[PDB]
Amino acid sequence: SGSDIEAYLERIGYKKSRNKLDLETLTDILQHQIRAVPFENLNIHCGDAMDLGLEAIFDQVVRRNRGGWCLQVNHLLYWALTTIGFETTMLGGYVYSTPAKKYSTGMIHLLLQVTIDGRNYIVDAGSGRSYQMWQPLELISGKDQPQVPCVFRLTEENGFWYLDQIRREQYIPNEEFLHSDLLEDSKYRKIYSFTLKPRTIEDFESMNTYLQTSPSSVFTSKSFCSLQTPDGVHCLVGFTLTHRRFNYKDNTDLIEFKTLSEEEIEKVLKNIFNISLQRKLVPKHGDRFFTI
Ligand code: NA
Q: What Å resolution does this PDB entry report?
A: 1.7
Neighbours of 125 (CB within 10 A): 29
Q: How far apart are CA 276 and CA 289, in angstroms?
A: 26
Q: How far is CA 206 from CA 90, 201, 228, in A?
A: 16, 10, 29
Confirm if 168 and 252 have CB atoms less than 8 A apart: yes
Neighbours of 13 (CB within 10 A): 10
Pairing type for strands 169-171 and 252-259 reads: parallel
User: How was this structure obtained?
Assistant: X-ray
- Whether 70 is catalytic: yes
- Whether 287 is catalytic: no
Beta-carbon contacts of 103 under 8 Å, excluding residues fewer than 6 positions away, are 94, 95, 96, 97, 190, 192, 193
What torsion do the CA atoms of 13, 15, 19, 25 make, to the nearest 10 degrees?
A: -50
Q: Which of 103, 75, 64, 77 is nearest to 189 (CA)?
A: 103
Q: Which of 32, 45, 70, 150 is catalytic?
A: 70
The answer to the question of whether 105 is labelled as a binding residue is yes
Confirm if 26 and 122 have CB atoms less than 8 A apart: no
Q: How far apart are CA 144 and CA 289, in angstroms?
A: 27
SS3 of residue 206 by DSSP: helix
Q: How far apart are CA 114 and CA 131, in angstroms?
A: 20
**Distance between Cα 120 and ligand 1 center (Å):** 13
Q: How far is CA 207 from CA 15, 73, 184, 225, in A?
A: 35, 16, 26, 20
Continuous H helices in the chain: 4-11, 23-36, 54-58, 70-84, 205-213, 218-221, 262-273
Confirm if 214 and 50 have CB atoms less than 8 A apart: no
Q: What is the DSSP track for 55-81? A: HHHHIIIIIT---B-HHHHHHHHHHHH
Q: How far apart are CA 243 and CA 173, in angstroms?
A: 12
The answer to the question of whether 75 is labelled as a binding residue is no
Beta-carbon contacts of 48 under 8 Å, excluding residues fewer than 6 positions away, are 278, 279
Q: What is the DSSP track for 85-107? A: T-EEEEEEEEEEETTTTEE-SS-
The answer to the question of whether 188 is labelled as a binding residue is no
Q: Which of 69, 135, 64, 98 is nearest to 279 (CA)?
A: 64
- Whether 124 is catalytic: yes
Q: How far apart are CA 21 and CA 5, in angstroms?
A: 15
The count of domains in the chain is 1
The answer to the question of whether 108 is labelled as a binding residue is yes
Q: Which of 225, 278, 254 is nearest to 34 (CA)?
A: 225
Phi, psi torsion values for 45, nearest 5 degrees: -90, 5
Confirm if 230 and 221 have CB atoms less than 8 A apart: no
Q: Which of 32, 45, 75, 109 is catalytic?
A: 109
Q: How far is CA 264 from CA 4, 223, 225, in A?
A: 34, 15, 15
Confirm if 8 and 76 have CB atoms less than 8 A apart: yes
Q: Note down the domain range covering 161.
A: 1-292
**Distance between Cα 182 and ligand 1 center (Å):** 36
Q: Which of 42, 41, 35, 43 is nearest to 14 (CA)?
A: 35
CATH of the domain at 120: 3.30.2140.20
Measured CA angle at 63 (ends 58, 64), to 5 deg = 105
Instruction: Return the bridge partners of 93, or none.
Output: 109, 194
212-249 residues labelled b (16+ CB within 10 A) or e (exposed): beeeebbbbbbbbbbbbeeebbbbbbbbbbbbbbbeee
Q: Which of 75, 124, 225, 235 is catalytic?
A: 124
Q: Which of 150, 245, 234, 133 is nearest to 189 (CA)?
A: 150
The kind and range of the H/E element at 157 are strand 151-157
Q: Which of 222, 235, 223 is nearest to 131 (CA)?
A: 235
Q: How far apart are CA 75 and CA 220, in angstroms?
A: 21
What single letter denotes the amino acid at residue 263? E
Confirm if 187 and 164 have CB atoms less than 8 A apart: no
Q: How far apart are CA 78 and CA 25, in angstroms?
A: 15
The answer to the question of whether 242 is labelled as a binding residue is no
